[PDB]
């Protein structure tokens, strides 16, 4: 119980001091879930209403789905920047 935090969720944290004493060594191997502690995969195999249905599915507001005018539509940047 040298580790000050529970080691059962993410990884086994082992804290150590090097011989010189000016360094701290941490060993963190991951922990896998026990087979017993998991379930097996399940073996058995209109305009107005449209906005309301869209709002209900995604828990969003109806105002989001209404269109916008030509002015803002043209302003949208056609080339979002993505590197790698």
């Amino acid at each position: 119980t040298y580790s000050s935090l529970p080691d059962d969720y993410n990884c086994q944290v082992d804290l150590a001091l090097t011989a010189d004493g000016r360094t701290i060594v941490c060993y963190h191997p991951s922990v896998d879930i026990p087979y017993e502690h998991t379930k097996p995969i399940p073996q058995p195999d209109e305009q107005g209403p449209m906005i309301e249905q869209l709002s209900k599915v995604f828990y969003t507001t109806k105002h989001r789905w209404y269109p916008h005018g030509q002015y803002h539509n043209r302003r949208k940047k056609l080339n979002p920047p993505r590197d790698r």
Binding site: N10, I33, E36, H37, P81
Partner: protein, 43 residues
């Protein structure tokens, strides 16, 4: 100077390997239970 354009750079850091130990997700650090029982399950 290089041929690269001189304009505002959004981020001063570029890496192709952002994560080494894995990207955090909510299920990380969450403990399981025997049989993987879901909450409130009578069984």
């Amino acid at each position: 100077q290089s041929g690269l354009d001189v304009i505002r750079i959004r981020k001063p850091f570029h890496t192709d390997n952002p994560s080494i130990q894995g990207q955090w997700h909510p299920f990380t650090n969450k403990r399981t239970a025997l049989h993987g029982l879901r909450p409130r399950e009578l069984r």
